[PDB]
């Protein structure tokens, strides 16, 4: 019914969430068009093998160069995370090259919408302007998130991408409307000029967000079978987070010293060991880059130390896990406050991003959280319990998605 130009932004927590999107729009009948850098071209392989050619297209433009990117490196889950005002800068130059390929198209195969993520609304909004396109943008974030950071009142960098998003048509946020209802109606009131959210979440995977660096099938051999369910411990900070030797070795001791089994997951970084230094466990596995859905929905698998992310706390709750909340930038500071505090549905067990855990405190809360009964694990369950009425079918995020791709036509 619509075409629809999906622009991801080329980080991880905001990619992987909007190709889910892109797949739910798909189903229900649009055509896509995703740009895309040419090595984030196979990101979409996945998503390329489920759909006709007719119905998914690909626009490969080349990565802008820029002095403060390293060559090959077009995803920001490879860099510092202070290198996105880099990504961003560089990315803007997009601009028009995409321009330039809308415009010698046959105007009858121009899209309808494009969704573009909010962190480039700056210039997408300036190229849907230019075609007369309605421009949606997206988030990986909660509204409870966005409403914090919008209302500030020295934003900048981020000023022109949350000035950018409001200008939007819309919002389509990865989020279900009952878990923060307030600050869904707030940040629709002032701060869509045009009053239009999209609550479409938790989306659901359909290999995901990159091939991970061991087997998947030999993962699940070690985990089943696990001689006991709920009482592996899973570990992994996201795509952005890289822990320092230090705190490695600390978090390290906490893990040996709760003699829990635990899946630890551990990043790189690319510029211009630290692990150290055993297994004397045949308790444990390392990494790479790992297949979270599947150990998180998991059985045997009944906590998760996460840096509370937004896309993971989604994950680990629908996985049915235990959260222990340790935020460290980004939105996980508002994550803790929502999840651990307003709502209780998780503990806080680290600090700050500099955090450095004692090793002996944080041994005995990781064997505590192999525990069935723990009241914030039903809190967090009770919440499962809201956002799958909400995905499927006929709850809030169904509605939301089916109201979305019906809107893209006008
Ligand atoms: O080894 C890894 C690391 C990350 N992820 C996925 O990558 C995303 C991480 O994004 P999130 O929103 O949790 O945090 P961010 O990376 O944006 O800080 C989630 O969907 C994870 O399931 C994964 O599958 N394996």
Same mark, same amino acid.
């Given at each position: 019914k619509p075409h629809v130009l999906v622009i991801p932004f080329p980080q991880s927590g905001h990619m992987v969430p909007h190709l889910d999107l892109t797949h739910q729009i798909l189903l229900r009948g649009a055509t896509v068009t995703v740009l895309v850098t040419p090595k984030n071209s196979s990101y979409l392989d996945a998503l390329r093998s489920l759909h006709s050619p007719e119905h998914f297209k690909t626009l490969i433009l080349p990565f802008p160069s820029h002095p403060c990117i390293p060559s090959?490196?077009? *995803? !920001?889950?490879? !860099?510092?995370? =202070?290198?996105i005002v880099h990504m961003f800068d560089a990315l803007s130059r997009l601009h028009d090259p995409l321009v330039d390929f809308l415009s010698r198209?046959?105007?009858?195969? !121009?899209?309808?919408?494009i969704l573009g993520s909010s962190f480039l609304s700056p210039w997408i909004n300036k190229v849907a302007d230019a075609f007369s396109i309605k421009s949606i943008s997206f988030l990986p974030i909660n509204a409870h998130s966005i409403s914090v950071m919008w209302a500030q009142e020295d934003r900048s960098f981020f000023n022109d991408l949350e000035t950018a998003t409001t200008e939007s048509y819309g919002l389509v946020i990865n989020?279900?409307?009952?878990? =923060?209802p307030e600050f869904v109606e707030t940040v629709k009131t002032r701060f869509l000029n045009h009053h239009r959210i999209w609550t479409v979440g938790p989306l659901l995977p359909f290999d995901?967000?990159?091939?991970?660096?061991?087997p998947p099938a030999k993962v699940s051999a070690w985990l089943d *079978?696990?001689? =006991? /369910?709920?009482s592996v411990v899973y570990v992994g900070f996201g795509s952005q987070i890289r822990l320092t030797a230090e705190q490695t070795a600390a978090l390290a001791a906490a893990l040996e010293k709760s003699s829990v089994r635990f899946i630890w997951a551990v990043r790189d970084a690319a510029k211009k060991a630290g692990?150290? =230094?055993?297994?004397?466990?045949?308790?444990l596995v390392i990494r790479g880059w790992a297949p979270q859905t599947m150990i998180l929905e998991h059985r045997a698998v009944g906590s998760y130390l996460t840096h509370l992310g937004w896309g993971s706390v989604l994950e680990g709750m629908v996985g049915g896990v235990m959260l222990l909340a340790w935020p460290m930038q980004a939105d996980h500071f508002f994550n803790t406050t929502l999840?651990? /505090?307003?709502?209780?549905?998780?503990?806080?067990v680290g600090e700050n991003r500099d955090s450095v855990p004692d090793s002996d405190k944080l041994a005995r809360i990781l064997a505590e959280?192999?525990?069935? /009964?723990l009241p914030e694990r039903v809190t967090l369950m009770k919440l499962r319990e809201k956002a799958m009425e909400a995905i499927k079918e006929g709850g809030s995020s169904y509605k939301n998605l089916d109201e979305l791709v019906a809107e893209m036509c006008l």
């Open positions: 090959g490196v077009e *995803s !920001l889950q490879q !860099l510092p995370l =202070e290198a198209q046959p105007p009858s195969d !121009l899209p309808d919408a989020s279900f409307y009952d878990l =923060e995901r967000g990159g091939q991970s660096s061991i *079978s696990c001689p =006991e /369910d709920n692990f150290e =230094e055993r297994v004397k466990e045949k308790g999840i651990v /505090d307003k709502l209780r549905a998780a503990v806080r959280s192999a525990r069935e /009964d």
